[PDB]
Design an enzyme around this catalytic site. Sequence first.
Site, short mmCIF file in Angstrom:
data_model
loop_
_atom_site.label_atom_id
_atom_site.label_comp_id
_atom_site.label_asym_id
_atom_site.label_seq_id
_atom_site.Cartn_x
_atom_site.Cartn_y
_atom_site.Cartn_z
N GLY A 1 70.41 -73.32 38.76
CA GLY A 1 70.44 -71.76 39.34
C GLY A 1 71.92 -71.27 39.20
O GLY A 1 72.23 -70.72 38.06
N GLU B 1 97.81 -78.54 22.40
CA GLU B 1 97.52 -79.47 21.20
C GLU B 1 96.35 -80.26 21.22
O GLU B 1 95.89 -80.69 20.14
CB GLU B 1 98.85 -80.67 21.30
N1 GTP Z 1 75.11 -86.10 36.36
C1 GTP Z 1 74.67 -85.62 37.29
N2 GTP Z 1 73.69 -84.44 37.59
C2 GTP Z 1 73.24 -83.89 38.99
C3 GTP Z 1 74.14 -84.25 39.83
N3 GTP Z 1 73.53 -83.57 40.89
C4 GTP Z 1 72.44 -82.59 40.34
N4 GTP Z 1 72.53 -83.11 39.01
C5 GTP Z 1 71.54 -82.21 38.05
O1 GTP Z 1 71.44 -80.97 38.30
C6 GTP Z 1 70.43 -80.46 37.36
C7 GTP Z 1 69.75 -79.45 38.36
O2 GTP Z 1 70.78 -78.59 39.06
P1 GTP Z 1 70.28 -78.07 40.57
O3 GTP Z 1 69.50 -79.32 41.30
O4 GTP Z 1 69.21 -76.92 40.60
O5 GTP Z 1 71.60 -77.59 41.26
P2 GTP Z 1 72.18 -76.22 40.62
O6 GTP Z 1 72.50 -76.44 39.17
O7 GTP Z 1 73.57 -76.09 41.57
O8 GTP Z 1 71.39 -75.16 40.87
P3 GTP Z 1 70.91 -74.91 42.37
O9 GTP Z 1 69.20 -75.36 42.71
O10 GTP Z 1 70.46 -73.35 42.60
O11 GTP Z 1 71.66 -75.47 43.25
C8 GTP Z 1 69.42 -81.53 37.48
O12 GTP Z 1 69.00 -81.96 36.02
C9 GTP Z 1 70.23 -82.83 38.08
O13 GTP Z 1 70.18 -83.84 37.04
C10 GTP Z 1 74.89 -85.31 39.93
O14 GTP Z 1 75.43 -85.59 41.14
N5 GTP Z 1 75.17 -85.75 38.75
#
Ligand code: GTP
Lengths: 429, 441, 372
Positions: free
Chosen positions: B144, B254
Amino acid sequence: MREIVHIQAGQCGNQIGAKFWEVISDEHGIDPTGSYHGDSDLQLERINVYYNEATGNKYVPRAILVDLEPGTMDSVRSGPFGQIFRPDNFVFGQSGAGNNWAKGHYTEGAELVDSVLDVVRKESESCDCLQGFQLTHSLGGGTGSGMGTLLISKIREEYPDRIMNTFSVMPSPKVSDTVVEPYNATLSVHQLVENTDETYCIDNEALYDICFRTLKLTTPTYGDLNHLVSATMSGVTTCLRFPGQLNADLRKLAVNMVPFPRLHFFMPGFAPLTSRGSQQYRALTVPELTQQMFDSKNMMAACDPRHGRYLTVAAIFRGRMSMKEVDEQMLNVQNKNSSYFVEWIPNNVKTAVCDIPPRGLKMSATFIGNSTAIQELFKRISEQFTAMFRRKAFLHWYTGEGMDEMEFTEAESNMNDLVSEYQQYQDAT
Amino acid sequence: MRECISIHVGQAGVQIGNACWELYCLEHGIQPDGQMPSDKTIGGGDDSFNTFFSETGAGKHVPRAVFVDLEPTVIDEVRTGTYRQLFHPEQLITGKEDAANNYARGHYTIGKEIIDLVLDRIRKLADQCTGLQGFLVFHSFGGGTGSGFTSLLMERLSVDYGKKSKLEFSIYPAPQVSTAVVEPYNSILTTHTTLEHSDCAFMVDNEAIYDICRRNLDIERPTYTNLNRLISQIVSSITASLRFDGALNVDLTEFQTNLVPYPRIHFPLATYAPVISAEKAYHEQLSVAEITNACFEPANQMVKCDPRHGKYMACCLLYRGDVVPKDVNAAIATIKTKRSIQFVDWCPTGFKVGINYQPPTVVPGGDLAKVQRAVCMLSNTTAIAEAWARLDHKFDLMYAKRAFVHWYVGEGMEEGEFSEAREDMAALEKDYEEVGVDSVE
Amino acid sequence: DTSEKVKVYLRIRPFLTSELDRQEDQGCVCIENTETLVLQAPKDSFALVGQATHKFTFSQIFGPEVGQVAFFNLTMKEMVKDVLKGQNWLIYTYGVTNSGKTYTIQGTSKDAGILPQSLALIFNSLQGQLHPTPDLKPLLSNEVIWLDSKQIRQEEMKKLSLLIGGDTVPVSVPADIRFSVWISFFEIYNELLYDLLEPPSTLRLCEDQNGNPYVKDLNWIHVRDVEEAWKLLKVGRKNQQQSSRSHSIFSIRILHLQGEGDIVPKISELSLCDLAGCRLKEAGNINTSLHTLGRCIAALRQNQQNRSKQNLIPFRDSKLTRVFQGFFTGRGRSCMIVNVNPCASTYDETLHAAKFSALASQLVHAPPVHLG
Ligand SMILES: Nc1nc2c(ncn2[C@@H]2O[C@H](COP(=O)(O)OP(=O)(O)OP(=O)(O)O)[C@@H](O)[C@H]2O)c(=O)[nH]1
Ligand SMILES: CC(=O)O[C@H]1C(=O)[C@@]2(C)[C@H]([C@H](OC(=O)c3ccccc3)[C@]3(O)C[C@H](OC(=O)[C@H](O)[C@@H](NC(=O)c4ccccc4)c4ccccc4)C(C)=C1C3(C)C)[C@]1(OC(C)=O)CO[C@@H]1C[C@@H]2O
Ligand SMILES: Nc1nc2c(ncn2[C@@H]2O[C@H](COP(=O)(O)OP(=O)(O)O)[C@@H](O)[C@H]2O)c(=O)[nH]1
Ligand SMILES: [Mg+2]
């Protein structure tokens, strides 16, 4: 903040509501007197989702009792949790519908709907930022269908932005003790298709099957069925109240579940479930929960999903766990059973994880399905409906309430179109 | 002076921020309270470096960061966790309602009335620098806030400041693993932001990091708290030259100059050689040659692609710890000798080298072995095209049937915009295929 | 039909002097012919795709030389005849800012738009073959209500209250049919139907005997002649360039009522729906409705004899397509009036409007682009 206004109508709605409020007060450690005697602080971090704060360090749920006719008011008010509810919300009339949708909608219900709307408006005005409404009722009955749909329509007219969530009990195809279930159920579905954001189809046949076969109960009663439904309904909104590695809410589930506006009928499910005497033999792992969810015999909708294709599914896990294991298991489910998933969705699975399990469990998880196989239940109702309507079996009990016959036909046609719509997506394309 | 403002957007952003700021506090010996016992111990130096911490009168060191979620569940953990007293109270939670995996809500409807606060806070942070700047924006595609609000914020920042480097650290969708069914839409809709506004974008993929953790670190059941630690190690290695002395310090300018041949090809891959578990820390020398060779192993890359399917257009090595130029030159010569590593004919040099004397630190409770030396490789390659192609296919498989489209159309997003986004992606792919072509005389 | 699809018609608005004063003329709108509109980008050298040329198919195209009455006389008069001949027809209208749709359809009293000219033609044609007073209401296309003396008087009071509180078609049957012509005017706003003929001071849907949806408790007003209809419509307009924020539907129903007092005579319906072209809420709703509408029209164009597949027309997803379900089904037919403007500032919107509303849309690109 994201508050929920809980509404319930009919005997089934009120009893499910009583069990649900018992479970929630257990989860947040709230005494029957309304005080708090829990241990973890997280219980009060988001208690505002369901409870208002009353002055004496007290908590009062946002429950509105719709047509708590005295036969059910005496049960609820004198029950174990009768005193938790504020008496101003005990809205009810006299001489209920008596298994008559027309009385529940036009004749008797229109006289009482004003009070319930006033109570709902007063409750909603107190919220910092309302998330949505949650309704619990039963189709095929009296007030629960008619007034339930009336309140859904009027509230959605008043509050169009907010999420209208409905937990409804369908009429079982075989285990029925009411003659005129088809008429009331058909009219209720016609009203429900156009006026809710997501509806969860529950059937008593499936709950009885789960109680007999999975939990090995010999004398199941309505208390146990309400227990299962309450467990599911708590599982759905767990992410609003507690933190987690991957958060979710009602709107997030709605976006990732409703590919088209009219396809919002779901199949709930819950895991783990097993009798006490066998609980020592099975260890709780994410593979076990994933295996139990997609088992066709654990579904609460009384419909084998394998007869169609999953438009989309969602798993909301609870408890400490590793994300790799979860992702691997869901991918394995998609790959192994690829015949039962829609081809034109690359990824049919939504995932959410909360790190606070239920009180007595290490791990739990809730499943929500959305598949074309659900069309089956509608077909069954439609069949029974026409089997009466062609003979005009009981129309005089309805047409006498100022209901033209045409209102039946439209509803039937609407249901058929809904079935046809689901049947569009069963074929590979 | 040299400072960088860290912005984090969305839950992935905030968790990566938590891991990163843990690593920075450990590196500079700053307590969770913000007090620094080494100040009275040494009585001198700028060890509370301005690159990531502003010093106040009382000796408290406040991080230079702002971050948003539109979902108070995630940032309230920071407000209650061990570092609640470190960060300034301006951690802009505004999530009375979430974006709910919807680009349109994040960009057009919900994101409004919050972007003003974020821009005001970023202006207040930027006014405190007497020197170099550059933003590090962390987020995740497919979500989101990470998709819509990030686009809004980038669009406003490119107008307010303009000539400032804006590095992007973005979580990309994996080929197979996904936690949402509307992920391709939100991923594709940010291509315009990532092209017109970002100055250099580093993509990582969760499936690749899972493979690295399972294979190298010997972690059967990893979770986000390890992937965030690895990404934090990457980000610390990139900004090491701004803080600690070294034989060859590479600044951000750089750094970008030798890695981005053309304006529209600013999408490098990243990797980190000495992943190495604790038990495996013995039985291996970890010389400069070994880690340099390990960086080019396709199995160790952080994006699910195969460099052997494409040509290397640029490469930058950032070394830390006990590293001497003789061994670095020998290892680079060995790499150039190998025929499995193909360089485009129009980039005869191919390598930028930076060396830093501060060896890496090990987070308490971590899983990385303490090492004397380490290396982080960044490489601009054409094989990254693969990572887009799969996603585009997924997008089409939905958009042919207008699945989930109305959820955006009701939020003020014109339908035709979808097509435009895909077109931009298509153009990007063609551009990469038009730079892997050997020159013709 | 012969794969009629929509038979879209195009109006191109002329320039105004104030527009030319600001150099709005940069060749945005032109025509290869009367059938295919050509839309090209203005030379937008400002702000520091040279043409991006798009082509849009239309049944007929009418440049700035064609006035409002010139537009009506060439396309829509036939449709009026077709309705009074015994058909049911529905004219959609679409456009954007400065497109001229609100002047093309309504216009002024002299250079009358399609709506006042439809009124003029229909009511002037049926003089001498109409019932002097209300006697029979066209509730439905297949049902009517016979009015007793008090009901007739009440309807006359309604007409007079709306009027007071602020030329020929082939049909010619004097002394055989006492035609009963009634009008209605409402609007769909935020998926809510509001009756608009009710003078300045929410409707429902339900199906008829054959399952055709219709609107309930619509203030149908009997009318005698042209000016009564125009005045009632003008007063109703106030309850709704200047453009709509809602989908405003006007309709007229003519009962071919023979002298014997035939109950359920042939009901001939002509309707016109002026469509609204990121106030947030309505905008989303507008887009939502338009999106659904586009799908429906696409289905209605995909399900012609060119494919001989019905698939699904998602008319149930909105009030706009549900109330006009009968025209998607086959109980009636529909066509389209598209408005555009050659002004540079309108171009993108204009382009989008064509892509939404043209009979068919194609990309030409103008290959002479890629100058650099
Ligand atoms: N690598 C990594 N990915 C994360 C982590 N937390 C969430 N994600 C990734 O975030 C992606 C989806 O994002 P959301 O859970 O929707 O969180 P957001 O991007 O802030 O969107 P919102 O739901 O509105 O909060 C997923 O594919 C997760 O894998 C993390 O701690 N590490
Ligand atoms: C003691 C023992 O060995 O039994 C356990 C137990 O874990 C088992 C047997 C429980 C038990 O449940 C049942 O026997 C049962 C019977 C009919 C319908 C539903 C359940 C248990 O009752 C349920 C109870 O679960 C909880 O405490 C959860 O927090 C649960 N709580 C309630 O439902 C609840 C009930 C009454 C009053 C207050 C709360 C919950 C579940 C989901 C969401 C929120 C709360 C537990 C640990 C047990 C018993 C007590 C035997 C099971 O139930 C649940 C929902 O967890 C049945 O199988 C599952 C898991 C286990 O096998
Ligand atoms: N799951 C469940 N269903 C119930 C319960 N009590 C009644 N029902 C169902 O509800 C239906 C009767 O509806 P009813 O409550 O009488 O409608 P009302 O008259 O408007 O209140 C029957 O088909 C029952 O199967 C209950 O405690 N649990
Ligand atoms: Mg969120």
